[PDB]
Design a protein around this ligand. Structure first.
Ligand code: 590
Length: 266
């Protein structure tokens, strides 16, 4: 809406570089572009042309052809979200562990905005795989795409984004009660949390798995999992395995799912 613009000042690129790039930091490069098709696609194109995208951050004020999982899309209006992609070198890590990189990303996004919201802890957390949920609404979406030897990690976070402009099941920090959210503070806090989680993933830190289970909204609840190909499986989510796959209890039978859309059954 018109009035939400006034709550959307531009991102300060120079300020973000001062905080996030330098000694003690793993980020090598940060850029803020006014508009692009997809930040994921852009970093994928860089890697495809020989660039070392490891530790490289790309942020866009607006995204016109955003990507979702399973060939879906991601909607956004200008300066209403934090829209970024980072590059991570993953070739030194066993392929079976790559699934945890996505979960670690959602963990970092959650921790960056969790204190800002005034919602009971039982309805704020991660829906498997890495959907950031708050009061039943989707606060953020994460997308991981492979470009050897890199994985491009994409984060779309609704800051002042109006649900009516993107999705009925969507929510934002503004719609959660946060009056005047500062994208500069949040982006800085996000990328520092993200740096920590990536390092934890790369070193197989068990603290990573323990922190996910403590924030999981899926584990313990009855769910319907929409599998790739259009098949549905109803059961109770019990745990995450060593590959970041969801373990389902289906009438005593264990079903491990590597990919799919989870619906918490109310
Ligand atoms: N199209 N559509 N609608 C719906 C989509 O079909 C659906 C897509 O969700 S999804 O399949 O699980 N995929 C994701 O959550 C990952 C999205 C990652 C987006 C980031 S943003 C920067 C980077 N670049 C890029 O192209 N993608 C990543 O979510 C809805 N949706 C779209 N925009 C939304 C939003 N801003 N907030 C909440 N829900 C949204």
């Amino acid at each position: 809406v018109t009035d939400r613009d006034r709550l959307r000042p531009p991102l300060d690129e120079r300020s973000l570089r001062d905080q996030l790039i330098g000694a003690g930091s793993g980020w090598r490069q940060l850029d803020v572009v006014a508009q692009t098709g997809s930040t994921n696609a852009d970093l994928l194109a860089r890697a495809a042309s020989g660039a070392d995208i490891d530790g490289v951050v790309l942020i866009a004020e607006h995204q016109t052809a955003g990507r979702g999982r399973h060939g879906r899309g991601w909607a956004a209006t200008a300066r209403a979200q934090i829209i970024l992609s980072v590059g991570v070198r993953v070739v030194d890590v066993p392929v079976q562990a790559w699934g945890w990189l996505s979960l670690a990303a959602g963990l970092a996004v959650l921790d960056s905005v969790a204190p800002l919201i005034a919602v009971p802890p039982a309805e704020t957390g991660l829906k498997w795989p890495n959907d950031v949920l708050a009061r039943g609404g989707k606060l953020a979406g994460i997308l991981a795409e492979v470009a050897q030897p890199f994985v491009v990690l994409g984060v779309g976070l609704n800051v002042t984004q109006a649900p009516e402009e993107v999705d009925p099941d969507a929510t934002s920090l503004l719609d959660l009660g946060v009056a005047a959210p500062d994208r500069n503070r949040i982006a800085s806090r996000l990328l520092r949390e993200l740096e920590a989680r990536i390092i934890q993933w790369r070193n197989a830190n068990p603290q990573l798995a323990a922190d996910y289970r403590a924030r999981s909204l899926t584990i313990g609840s009855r769910v319907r999992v929409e599998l790739p190909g259009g098949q549905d499986v109803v059961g109770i989510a019990r745990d995450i395995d060593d590959q970041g796959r969801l373990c389902l209890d289906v009438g005593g039978r264990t079903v491990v799912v590597s990919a799919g859309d989870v619906v918490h059954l109310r």
